[PDB]
Every structure is written in C-alpha cells, then in structure tokens.
C-alpha cells in the first residue's frame, strides 16, 4: 500500500464521504446488542485470562510441583 510521502491523487482531491442512511430501531437495538456482547465476551475473556494465570501459577508452584521437587531432591541426596 502507499506510504506517508505519496502525492495524494486527483480523483480523491475532492470526494464526498456521503455517510450511510441511519435507520432508527435497528440502530438502537443494534447498540443494545453490541453492548451486551462486549460485556459477555469480556466475562469470558476474564475467565480465560484467570485460567491461564492459574495454569502458570500452579505449574510454577502448586502442590504436585512441590511434591515432585522434594522427591527429586531427596532421591539426589
């Protein structure tokens, strides 16, 4: 694609960004949907983030982790 130093073209030296016709009830019910979704997938994202953090923390230091560590050290001695 183009860079910051490409002369802009003629065809786009003027071109109206005519915006889309806003319908009414679809716009508001669509907003109420967009906000509900962002909320529930945010909840799912927090669940997955805390699950990943749990996996990292129990793998680093859990109870079976300490168990196999102490078993290995005792076997070494």
């Amino acid at each position: 694609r183009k860079t910051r130093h490409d002369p802009l073209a003629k065809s786009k030296i003027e071109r109206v960004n005519m915006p889309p016709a806003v319908d009414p009830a679809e716009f508001f019910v669509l907003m109420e949907r967009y906000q509900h979704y962002r909320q529930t997938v945010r909840a799912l994202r927090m669940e997955f983030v805390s699950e990943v953090q749990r996996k990292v923390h129990e793998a680093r230091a859990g109870v079976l982790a300490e168990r196999k560590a102490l078993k290995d050290a005792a076997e070494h001695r």
């Binding site: 669509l30 949907r33 979704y37 529930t40 997955f48 805390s50 990943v52």
Partner: protein, 116 residues
C-alpha cells in the same frame, strides 16, 4: 521481526487454490502478512460443502482458550464461527443480517401475492 506496536489475532488464513478456498485458524500477529508467520495454528475451516455436505470446521478449543487468555484479538469471521459453534454468544450482526432478510423475503411475499 518485531512490528512496532500490535497484538495477536485469532484469524483465518486462505490456503487453497483458485475457486477452492480454505481457511486455517491461525494465531498470528496483526501486523504480519495474512499467509505468514503464525505463532500457533488453532484450527481449520473448509467452507466448501462435502459430498455428503457438512462444511467441516475444527478448533483447538483449549489452545483458543489459552490464546484468548493471553490476549488474542479475535477477528470478525472468527467471532462468527465461534458463535455458530457455541464457544462464543451468537454475534449481533449474524442476527441483524438475519432479520434484514426475514423482512426482505416478506417484501417479496407481498409483492408476489399482488402479482398473483
């Protein structure tokens, strides 16, 4: 490379031939080529219908959970497929474009009845 700024993105990568598409769910950095360096392939989506006809899709749901929990920004077709599946709530636009056709068929039903 590095790519100044950016995040991971669970997205679809085209990998078929002409007139025969196929998307492989990939967890790649956003600032990377479409078909390029992916951190982990998370699944595959064959959109053409089978001989029996079942449009197969596949998902390492556990690894998708891991990468979402690591910070992957899921893209819109991935949100569509995950709604279709049931790992994510049905996407707003997949119900809104539904109601746009529902009323479009009606626009036809009435006009058709007037013709008859």
């Amino acid at each position: 490379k590095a790519y100044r700024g950016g995040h991971l993105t669970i997205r679809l990568a085209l990998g078929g031939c002409t007139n025969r598409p196929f998307y492989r769910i990939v967890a790649a950095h956003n600032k990377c080529p479409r078909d390029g360096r992916f951190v982990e392939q998370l699944g595959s989506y064959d959109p053409l219908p089978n001989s029996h006809g079942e449009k197969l899709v596949a998902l390492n749901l556990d690894r998708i959970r891991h990468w979402i929990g690591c910070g992957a920004h899921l893209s819109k077709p991935m949100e569509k497929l995950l709604g279709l599946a049931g790992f994510f709530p049905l996407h707003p636009m997949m119900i809104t474009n539904a109601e746009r056709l529902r009323r479009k068929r009606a626009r036809e039903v009435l006009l058709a009845s007037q013709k008859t």
